[PDB]
Amino acid sequence: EVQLQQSGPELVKPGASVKISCKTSGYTFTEYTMYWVKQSHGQSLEWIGGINPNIDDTTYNQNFKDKATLTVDKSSSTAYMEFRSLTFDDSAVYYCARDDKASFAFWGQGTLVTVSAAKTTPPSVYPLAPGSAAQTNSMVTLGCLVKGYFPEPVTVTWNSGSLSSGVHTFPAVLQSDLYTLSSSVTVPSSTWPSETVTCNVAHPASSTKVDKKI
Amino acid sequence: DIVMSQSPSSLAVSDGERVTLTCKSSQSLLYSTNQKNYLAWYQQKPGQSPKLLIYWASSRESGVPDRFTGSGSGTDFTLTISSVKAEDLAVYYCQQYYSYPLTFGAGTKLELRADAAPTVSIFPPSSEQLTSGGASVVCFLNNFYPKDINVKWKIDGSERQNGVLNSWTDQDSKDSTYSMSSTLTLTKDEYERHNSYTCEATHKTSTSPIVKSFNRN
C-alpha cells in the first residue's frame, strides 16, 4: 500500500553526526505528517518528535532537546533525521511513523544505529569440554566461547549444518567495547569422544573463518 | 506529562484461552465533543514493524481478525482476545493521542507452558584460555522454565558478584522452553590461587537449591 524505506545499519564513532532517512512512496508528502519513535532496551518505545512538511511545524520531546532536528525534502519526497552529540545511550533502533489518520499509522523497517569507540577485530574462539571422566546423564553437552569480535553478527553453526537440532544461541553482551557470545548443543554419548565435533564461526566483516575441533 | 502503566508484566497462556490486557492512564483521555477516547493498541512481532489493531479503544481496524476486540473508555482500557493462535506470540503496547508529548506503555508479553528444569551444565576452563592471559568459567541453564531464576557464583565458599555476565534467551519454538548463560571471567593468577568453584542456582519448582561444583587440582 505505502512503502517506508529507510537506510541501512551504520557504524559511527562517538562524537560524529548520523543522518537517518525515510523514503516515502505511494502517497503525497505534503498532506500527512511524519513522526519518529525510538525503541530502546528491546521493548521500551520512546517518542522523538514530529514535523509538518507543509507549514514547517516542528515539535520535539524534552529528552531530545538540542539533539534531534527534523528536516523534510519537498523535492525528493522523503524525510531526514539527524542527531548531534552522540553518546553511549543512543544505541537504539529508530523508526519513522506515518500519521495518516487517527485510525491507523504505518511504520518502517527500522535503522540499527550502534555506536562504540571500537576497531574491527577477528574473533578468538576456544573449545569447551567437560573435565569429568564420567557422568550420570546419557547426553554430553559441549560448546565453544566466542570472545573479541566487532561488529555484530557472527553466524555459529555446528558440523557444517548437519547437527542443526538442539542448538542454543545466546545473545551477546557488550564488555570493554566488544561483544561476546556462546553456544551449547546436546550430543549423545555414543559418538563423543570417538567421533569428533567442530565449531564453525563466521565473520563476514573481517572475512575470516576458523574451525576448532573438540 | 500523561504517563501510563500496564499490568501485568507477563503471563503464561495456552492455545485457545482468553487473554485480557489492562492499560491505565493517570488522567482522563476522553474528548467531550465527539465522545472519543484517544488511545490505540499496538502489536509488534519479533523482527517486524509494530502494527495497530484497535483504534478509539472500542473499534476494529480492517485487516485485523475478529478475535481482537477492545472495550473501556476514559481511564480503564481493556483488550480482550477471544481465542489466541500460534502466531499471537508478540508484544503489545498502548499509546495515547490526547496531549503532547506522546508517551508509550511498559510492554506486555505472553508466554507458554510449562515444567522445564536443568541439572548440570558445568564446564571447566580449557587450556587455550590461559595462554591469552585470562580465565573464564561458564554456567549454562538449558531447558528451564520459568525465566524468573536467580544465579549465584561461589568461589571457595565465598560469594563473588563482580565479573558475572548473564545472558537470557527467548522462548523456544519446539518445546516452549528457555535457556540462560552465565559467564564469570577473571585473570590468570586469581584462577591459580583457588581450587573449588561452585555454580549455584535456585529454582521455583524445587524445594532445595541445586548444588554442584568441580575442583581444579
What does the H/E/C string look like for chain B? CCCEEEECCEEECCCCCCEEEEEEECCCCEECCCCEECEEEEEECCCCCEEEEEECCCEECCCCCCCEEEECCCCEEEEEECCCCCCCCCEEEEEECCCCCCCCCCCEEEECCCCCCCCCCEECCCHHHHCCCEEEEEEEEEEECCCCCEEEEEECCEECCCCEEEEECCCCCCCCCEEEEEEEEEEHHHHHCCCEEEEEEECCCCCCCEEEEEECC
Which domains does chain A possess? 3-115 (2.60.40.10), 124-213 (2.60.40.10)
Same domain as B104, residue B199: no
Resolution, given in Å to one decimal, reads 3.5
Contact assessment for residue A48 and residue A61, using Cβ atoms and an 8 Å cutoff: yes
From residue B15, alpha-carbon distances to A148, B36, B109 in Å are 42, 33, 15
Q: Which candidate from A104, A127, A182 shows the least CB-CB separation from B181?
A: A182
Same domain as B93, residue B157: no
What is the C-alpha separation between B140 and A185, in angstroms, rounded?
11
Residue positions counted in chain A: 214
Task: Locate B71 and state its grid cell.
Answer: 472495550
What is the phi/psi pair of residue A64, to 5°? Answer: -115, 35
Same domain as B175, residue B84: no
Do strands B76-81 and B150-155 pair parallel, antiparallel, or not at all (unpaired)? unpaired
Amino acid occupying residue A70:
L
* CA B35 to chain centroid: 37
A182: nearest CA partner in chain B:
B181
3-class secondary structure, A160:
helix
Instruction: Indicate left, alpha or beta for A85 from its phi (over 0: left) and psi (-120 to 50: alpha).
Output: left
3-class secondary structure, A161:
helix
Contact assessment for residue B140 and residue B119, using Cβ atoms and an 8 Å cutoff: no
Do strands B108-111 and B10-12 pair parallel, antiparallel, or not at all (unpaired)? parallel
What is the C-alpha separation between A53 and A63, in angstroms, rounded?
23
Q: Does B171 touch chain A (CB under 8 A)?
A: no
Q: Do B49 and A95 touch (CB under 8 A)?
A: yes
Same domain as B105, residue B21: yes
Dmax of chain B from CA atoms? 79
Domains identified in chain B, total number: 2
What is the C-alpha separation between A95 and A105, in angstroms, rounded?
12
Same domain as B127, residue B33: no
Q: Which residues contact A24 (CB under 8 A, 6 or more apart)?
A: A2, A3, A4, A34, A77, A78, A79, A98
Q: Does B119 touch chain A (CB under 8 A)?
A: yes
What is the C-alpha separation between B109 and B100, in angstroms, rounded?
27
Same domain as B204, residue B155: yes
Q: Is residue B116 part of a domain?
A: no
Same domain as B104, residue B18: yes
Among B89, B111, B133, give the residue marking a domain's end: B111
State how far residue B101 is from chain A, nearest Cα, in angstroms.
Answer: 6
Same domain as B86, residue B24: yes
List the one residue out of B193, B50, B183 whose CA is nearest residue B129. Answer: B183
From residue B60, alpha-carbon distances to A90, B54, B108 in Å are 35, 5, 20
By residue range, what is the domain housing residue B38?
4-111
Same domain as B63, residue B131: no
What is the C-alpha separation between A151 and A207, in angstroms, rounded?
12
List the one residue out of A99, A91, A77, A89 whose CA is nearest residue A28. Answer: A77
A64: nearest CA partner in chain B:
B101
What is the C-alpha separation between B167 and A143, in angstroms, rounded?
15
Same domain as B137, residue B101: no
Q: Do A102 and B124 touch (CB under 8 A)?
A: no
**What CATH number should be reported for the domain holding residue B165?**
2.60.40.10
Q: Which residues contact B137 (CB under 8 A, 6 or more apart)?
A: B123, B124, B125, B183, B184, B197
Among B56, B90, B111, give the residue marking a domain's end: B111
Which residues make beta-bridge pairs with A201? A156
Same domain as B130, residue B104: no
Q: Which candidate from B52, B142, B185 shows the least CB-CB separation from A184?
A: B142
**What is the experimental method?**
cryo-EM
Q: Which residues contact A34 (CB under 8 A, 6 or more apart)?
A: A22, A24, A50, A51, A53, A70, A72, A79, A96, A97, A98, A99
Q: Is residue B117 part of a domain?
A: no
Do strands B50-55 and B39-44 pair parallel, antiparallel, or not at all (unpaired)? antiparallel
Q: Does B31 touch chain A (CB under 8 A)?
A: no
Q: Is residue B65 part of a domain?
A: yes
From residue A51, alpha-carbon distances to A32, A48, A73, A176 in Å are 10, 11, 11, 38
From residue B211, alpha-carbon distances to B152, B164, B197 in Å are 11, 18, 11
Same domain as B143, residue B45: no
Calculate ∠ Cα A145-A113-A5, nearest 5°.
120
Calculate ∠ Cα B23-B24-B30, nearest 5°.
105
Q: Do A44 and B124 touch (CB under 8 A)?
A: no
What is the C-alpha separation between A159 and A151, in angstroms, rounded?
24
Among B65, B81, B111, give the residue marking a domain's end: B111
